[PDB]
DNA sequence: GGGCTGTGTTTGTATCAAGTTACCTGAATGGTAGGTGGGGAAGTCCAAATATTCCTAGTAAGACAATTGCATTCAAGGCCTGGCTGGTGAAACCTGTTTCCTGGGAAG
């Protein structure tokens, strides 16, 4: 009937750790590259295997970030991640100077 | 034109330990690009082993040290002895 | 060509779904303004390294091996697209 | 005139990965100036042990989930299941794989 | 007269962040390398600039570890580091598999 | 040559003094059995990579550039000794 | 930058501590050498401003 | 025998912006080994730029791209324009 | 006691790949001659490792004091979940254009 909080959530963890699908969709990630590329050189083309080389590398970083974020949230006797965790996750690896 | 690859030489290894097994196209490219990357790690560490000992020569000794660096632990015990079989078999021939 | 408000294209469930792949049960509502920031840092250190390859060969199309060569540079190798 | 039977050097060492193709990727990659005759033999063996060891483990995960062909999820999951294969590819993303199934056993429901 | 706890401690932080001295002494670190080297090859010699290349690289790692440990201890509303912090410091960087 | 009990050579103040360089005020008494463990992990991934260079040139002395080449391999570069 | 830190601490010659401290004082010089240990340097003076005494 | 170095060419730069400044021995070796490392990053990325575009030639264009990759942000704006002065001055001579 | 979502089993076809080959060229091999690089054996000198003591400094320890860390309780806020609406994303279709894409070619 009424699920408790943390039950539909844990169904999602075993769901998405099994599939191989695209989580960030294509066109709202393709247009993100058409903002950062405009600075360094206007009028560039992209092969769709290179955009997909980013959509499987940006999703390779956040999942590598959030799984190292959630270590901190558990570490502070919590089960909730917070933006003080990520900003201290990245300072340990040296991914932000 | 011609794209050289390692795709054919996977079916000659896939049909050695799993003879009733196919392999998809987009999984070939991983085992294709696994090879080209693990190629130039071993070569590109044997290359930098040539400068560190002032020789212009990549021997088959220098590939052995550039596999005992990249492969950890128990792969470094097998892939050394899975090469020195294929050399001693090679040199006793010809 | 200019299309703005597309750091806001990384929607609120699609950061939650990425959070669920990392093994995260409960999240805050202030990760969404942190994730979009850390994402655009990571794409301003790949596209900045990818375009200098494509400009160097005087190509107008940043091809598939270009991005892989950029990710080769940072020490985060991507298989499956070549290179 | 004719000549003898051309026996390939991959068949003269008992390997499957070529040695003729590896020996022109040590003289057109500017790795060094001289490349010994035994070095692309020895390197095509180490390319052949490590190509088995993934596909040996990629065969099992295909079988344990009732599959004929190996899709990249199995390559994603054959890596990071083995310990020493993971420490080689510790920095490496595999495309179209997702991650291993993992919960930290604190998020379990109450 | 009687210092409070945290006063002689904070004198040490501004002391050792100023000097360049050796903290781990030489001979009780030189003999540590004569335990790990015995496995891989017995009867090896060491140049003293190579032992010192380790004494300034091991001290380059723990200080890089403890300064990333103390971020976690402050993060759990504490001022004390604990061995649950280090074992979660290293899991974030990937320095232990 | 064998000299044991020298992971216990990293003494109790010399881990505290390393803790003070990191900016740490108060420590536990159970870091001392953690630090000696994390230290010997780091020297079983450098000496294992250093000796394979010194054996490769058939030298009996692990020289100064050898360790720097090992630390080059892991991605932790050490300046000041060459290499 | 190594000349300034030698001057600000009243030194004629530049010892490696100044090279340690000229790096990691500048931001963009640090992002080049972010992985790099400099020998015989120690670290910058740093407290997280929570360990201050009470 | 002979150890080539960059130690002499530091005093010809140290005495350009701080003419009343010495430098120690063990700090020379850092700026010595800073050079040899930042040499082979730029060369060893210009080298791998030769294979990626199928040329056997390291031009002075390829060193410019292998400095806009290694140097971040504001160093990549100066060290490009601090090279093209030293080339245009060089080529107008001779 | 009941329910929901995940899971499984069976069928058909489309698609993807497996198959075999045709050629044709690219490349892969065979036989050789040449030089060079490296490998090997040596020696004086070189750098490190040891045996020692000596002294000293900080290490180790025992005691004490006070803060912090922990565990509980309190209070509520924040977030998760779901019933709903709709705007866009994606998949399928069509193309002209643009760029490449080596490759060859001309001309200064
Ligand atoms: Mg004319």
Numbering used by the authors:
A (entry chain A), E (entry chain E): 39 to 135
B (entry chain H), H (entry chain D): 29 to 122
C (entry chain B), F (entry chain F): 20 to 102
D (entry chain G): 9 to 118
G (entry chain C): 65 to 118
Per the authors:
Integration of the reverse-transcribed retroviral genome into a host-cell chromosome is catalysed by integrase (IN), an essential viral enzyme (reviewed in1). To carry out its function, a multimer of IN assembles on viral DNA (vDNA) ends forming a highly stable nucleoprotein complex, known as the intasome. The nucleoprotein complex from the prototype foamy virus (PFV) contains only a tetramer of IN, making this well-characterised intasome an ideal model to study the basic mechanisms involved in retroviral integration. Herein, we employ a combination of cryo-EM and single-molecule Förster resonance energy transfer (FRET) assay to understand what impact retroviral integration has on the structure of the target NCP.
Following isolation by size exclusion chromatography, the intasome-NCP complex was incubated in the presence of Mg2+ to facilitate strand transfer. We then used cryo-EM imaging and single-particle approaches to determine the structure of the resulting post-catalytic assembly to 3.9 Å resolution. As previously observed, intasome engages the strongly preferred site on the nucleosomal DNA, at SHL 3.515,24. According to the atomic model, at the integration site, DNA is lifted by 7 Å from the histone octamer and bent to allow access to the IN catalytic centre, in excellent agreement with the earlier observations based on the crystal structures of the PFV strand transfer complex and the lower-resolution intasome-NCP cryo-EM data. Intasome engages nucleosomal DNA non-symmetrically at two distinct sites: at the strand transfer site, as well as at the opposing gyre, which nestles in the cleft between one catalytic and one outer IN subunit. Near the integration site, the C-terminal alpha-helix of histone H2B makes direct contact with the C-terminal domain of one catalytically competent IN subunit, providing corroborating evidence for the previously reported role of PFV IN residues Pro135, Pro239 and Thr240 in engaging the C-terminus of H2B15. Furthermore, the higher quality of the new cryo-EM map allowed us to build a backbone model for a segment of the N-terminal H2A tail, revealing intimate contacts of H2A Lys-9 and Arg-11 with the IN C-terminal domain. Concordantly, truncation of the first 12, but not 8 H2A residues lead to a reduction of intasome-NCP complex formation. Furthermore, Ala substitutions of either H2A at Lys-9 or Arg-11 affect complex stability, while a combination of the two substitutions fully abrogated stable complex formation under conditions of the pull-down assay.
